Amino acid sequence: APSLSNLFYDPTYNPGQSTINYTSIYGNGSTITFDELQGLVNSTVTQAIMFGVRCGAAALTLIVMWMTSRSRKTPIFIINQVSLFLIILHSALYFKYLLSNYSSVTYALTGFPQFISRGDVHVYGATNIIQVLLVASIETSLVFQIKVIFTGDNFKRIGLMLTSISFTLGIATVTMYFVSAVKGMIVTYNDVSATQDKYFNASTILLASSINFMSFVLVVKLILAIRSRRFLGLKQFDSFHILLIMSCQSLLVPSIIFILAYSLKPNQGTDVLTTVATLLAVLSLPLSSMWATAANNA
């Protein structure tokens, strides 16, 4: 503490317009303000916050789903476990990414490819493969939720149609995620300072449209299946009510979160809200099973 400068006593000076001087590949001065830097750090912290929420919610849902799911060896239980373990493992690799040398402001300000370690490239690839397997597990669950729920309906013509369309969408999104993954891998392995996000947007919209399709089918069907129970009988509080509530939640909240992720300001780190939408689309079914068992037991 040699001596406090005059600007410590001025009540009008703001640090946000002050300039940082640092070295970069493009030039020598490359001035940047503390508010672009705090935007970068706030985006990184916001991504970390949502991925922490994902990791904690998925881990505790996995733990609770074991403690209480009496119907072990069901395919939907095994799929739900594979999906929760893949959410946890994806969140873990991402938690390394946020604390690595690609999310650091060292690389986001100074585009130096020497700072890059090839292990970080391998972590990037492992995360992309785990995301592909996650989408595969989610669509396996959904094709297994429409196949099983369409068994027993007299109108099996339209049930088979619905299974077919859903399964087509599942294969299309899984193939698009794998194509996006490999088209990002060849570019990253070749040049560490480039990206291929062209197919990303398409694969995420494909997944969102699949989820939207599922919530439509499950809500339409359950609506006709409580209208048939209201013209004869009544539908106000049975487990029927729990499935209908979770399917209306799956209808309204992940779509709202997808549009919120596509509408808000860019570069603020809010773009990973699509992962909260997929988190809730995953967590609708195990929580639905828990409520269903805890309203059937009585």
Binding site: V121, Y124, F200
Partner: peptide
Amino acid sequence: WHWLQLKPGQPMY
């Protein structure tokens, strides 16, 4: 409204 942007090596969301 905007397209999602991946930083030069951001793994998949």
